[PDB]
Design a protein around this ligand. Structure first.
Ligand SMILES: [Zn+2]
Length: 260
């Protein structure tokens, strides 16, 4: 069944250090002929620290060597310069130094501070990203028969205490997009999650076709989520349990609380 790699880390300087160490390892293991490897970034304080480390420690590998082509795994429907934007975060800490031809944010250019985006906006952005992904990445049939979804080399993920990952929220339609017909779906956060803005996100079908999936999570409050993904039998499962079906490698980089 589900056999993922799990590693526990005492601190943030440590989990983030392992997160960046895990990315460089895949890069190096793949070798230069395979580069640039596609990586779908996550937002959040933990991935941000991993990005700050790639910047500080491995810019030559990313810039001069062009090891990664950067995509966003999920995004908030706000302007790119917004503090609530995942790309804005990744840009500030790492992406400002990466060649423009290796950086692909979602196109939120239609979102202004004058009007909250709706799902109709999110959907237009999702469909456009999905199109770009299909021209840039290799496409794999879902189940030797199913529709074609892009194959990322790496997808970095976070977890919410509501059981969600990326911007795939509970009860959502995106959560039900597992057959490969939809590559980038949309979603609105759950009661306990913020910011309260429409999201675009890689669908579960897309994520399950990724060659490697790296999940970084901390906090006691998210322990039920990890337990729920790893449990032999689904009971009151978190959304993130869909990760069990990943076709690639899966790794969980956890702090002490969340592990136990
Ligand atoms: Zn810099």
């Amino acid at each position: 069944s589900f056999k993922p790699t799990i590693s526990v880390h005492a601190t943030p300087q440590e989990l983030s250090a392992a997160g960046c160490r895990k990315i460089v390892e895949i890069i190096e293991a793949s070798g230069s002929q395979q580069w640039p490897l596609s990586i779908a970034l996550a937002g959040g304080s933990t991935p941000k620290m991993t990005y700050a480390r790639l910047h500080d420690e491995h810019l030559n590998l990313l810039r001069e060597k062009r090891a990664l082509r950067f995509f966003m795994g999920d995004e908030r429907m706000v302007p790119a310069d917004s503090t609530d934007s995942n790309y804005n975060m990744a840009r500030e800490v790492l992406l400002h130094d990466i060649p423009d031809d290796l950086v692909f944010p979602f196109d939120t250019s239609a979102v202004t501070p004058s009007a909250e985006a709706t799902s109709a906006d999110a959907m237009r952005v999702a469909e456009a990203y999905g199109k770009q992904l299909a021209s840039l990445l290799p496409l794999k049939s879902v189940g030797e028969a199913g529709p074609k979804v892009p194959v990322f080399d790496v997808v970095l993920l976070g977890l919410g205490s509501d059981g969600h990952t990326a911007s795939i929220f509970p009860g959502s339609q995106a959560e039900k997009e597992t057959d490969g017909k939809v590559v980038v779906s949309v979603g609105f956060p759950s009661e306990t999650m913020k910011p309260k803005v429409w999201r675009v996100t890689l669908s579960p079908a897309t994520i399950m076709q990724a060659r490697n999936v790296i999940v970084l999570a901390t906090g006691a409050e998210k322990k039920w989520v990890v337990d729920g993904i790893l449990a032999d039998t689904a009971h009151k499962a978190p959304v993130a349990r869909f990760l069990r079906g990943c076709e690639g490698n899966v790794s969980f980089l956890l702090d002490k609380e969340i592990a136990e």
